Paper text:
However, in T. brucei there are no enzymes for de novo synthesis and this parasite relies solely on its salvage pathways to make its purine nucleoside monophosphates.
In the complex with 6 there are two separate dimers in the asymmetric unit, and in the complex with IMP or 5 two independent subunits are present in the asymmetric unit. Compound 6, with hypoxanthine as the base cannot form a hydrogen bond between the exocyclic amino group and the main chain carbonyl of D173. Compared to 3, the purine ring of 6 is translated by ~1 Å, however four hydrogen bonds (two to K145 and two to V167) that hold the purine ring in place are conserved in the two complexes. The phosphonyl oxygen atoms in 6 form hydrogen bonds with the amide nitrogen atoms of D117, T118, A119, L120 and the side-chains of T118 and T121 similar to the binding of one of the conformations of 3. Compound 6 with one fewer carbon atom than 3, is able to reach into the 5′-phosphate binding site with its phosphonate group, thus explaining the similar Ki values for 3 and 6 (15.8 μM vs 21.2 μM). Compound 2 (with guanine as the base) and 6 (with hypoxanthine as the base) both have Ki values significantly lower than their corresponding nucleoside monophosphates, while the remaining five ANPs have Ki values similar to or greater than those for the nucleoside monophosphates. Common to 2 and 6 is the fact that they both have five carbon atoms linking the base to the phosphorus atom and this is a key factor that results in tighter binding compared to the other inhibitors. However, 2 binds more tightly to human HGPRT (0.5 μM vs 2.3 μM), while for 6 the reverse is true since it binds more tightly to TbrHGPRT (>100 μM vs 15.8 μM). For 6 the well solution was 25% PEG 3350, 0.2 M sodium iodide, 0.1 M Bis-Tris propane, pH 6.5.
Author numbering:
A (entry chain B): 7 to 79, 102 to 195
B (entry chain A): 7 to 79, 104 to 197
The structure:
């Protein structure tokens, strides 16, 4: 890539990782009686750049028999909620959402992140399902942006410093 | 997909159709000097369910050299509105004519599924991936009451589904 220094995770790697995550989600929600219309899996997509991760993870979940219902960031009480976030760094944004969604009394609530930065936590918070982990470097791609750009990049890559230093 | 009557368009057929559309869009926006950060193609996504179509189209556009900047629901920039379904064109005509009051450089429309027969006002999108007649379809972001967006193919919903779920 013209604007990067290292491809941390390609598109094929992320898809393979999400497939294994889907197999675990299909087993952890096996006896939840998940079925379309009646009782699907309410997916609460948080953050603007998560639509890439959501559209791919939701389709992979459907391949493993996990029906989904997508909401972007109510009819949350009593139903099973799964929060999707494109990246997890400080866990401040996600902890706020989980505490907000728990105000509606869901049957179960767990989190799944595509990119996890454990070395950026301002508060302790562990996500149930994690696609991939990334060190404390600024990355773009797969929905992750640098000022509303480089979201269409198919891979998670480290943004070259000359870009955001010049910008 | 034995909850449906037919599979109108597969995931591969749509992408291979979008490949040809992305080449078409790249040729039209060639003299616009599109580049990330400085001057990308502003993608206006509508109808909530278009997140599957938007996530695939911006990545396919990136392969053909078209940098994007997604917005979900801006002056002197190029606007390309994306909708998962174009039927009566009442939603798109309102969005388009509302965007033109902000004086964009050039606003066009790209729709994944288009019902050209079944429209309430004259409207012709600049880019259409596929046609669909008077039949209710789901999949690829198209829902029946917030469900069946995870279906990777545009399929016609079984009539008894909305006959059983309507009551
Ligand atoms: O590498 C990155 N690429 C895009 N955005 C990034 C990156 N690292 C941090 N962030 C911002 C995350 C936004 C909200 C999450 P949280 O920090 O609240 O957990
Ligand atoms: O086949 C369909 N599957 C899901 N939703 C559908 C379908 N046909 C029409 N619609 C509703 C479209 C909502 C708005 C469109 P418009 O206002 O631009 O005509």
């Amino acid at each position: 890539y013209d604007f990067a220094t290292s491809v941390l995770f390609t598109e094929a790697e992320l898809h393979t990782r999400m497939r294994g995550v889907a197999q675990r989600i299909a087993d952890d929600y096996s006896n939840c009686n998940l079925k379309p219309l009646e009782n699907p899996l309410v997916i609460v997509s948080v953050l603007k750049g998560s639509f890439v991760f959501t559209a791919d993870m939701v389709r992979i979940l459907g391949d493993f028999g996990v029906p989904t219902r997508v909401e972007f960031l109510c009819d949350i009480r009593g139903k099973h909620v799964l929060v999707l976030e494109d990246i997890l760094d400080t866990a401040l944004t996600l902890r706020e959402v989980v505490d907000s969604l728990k105000k509606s009394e869901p049957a179960s609530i767990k989190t799944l992140v595509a990119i996890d930065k454990p070395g950026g936590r301002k508060i302790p918070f562990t996500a149930e399902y994690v696609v991939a982990d990334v060190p404390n470097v600024f990355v773009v791609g797969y929905g992750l942006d640098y000022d509303q750009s480089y979201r269409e990049v198919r891979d998670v890559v480290i943004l070259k410093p000359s870009v955001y230093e010049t910008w």
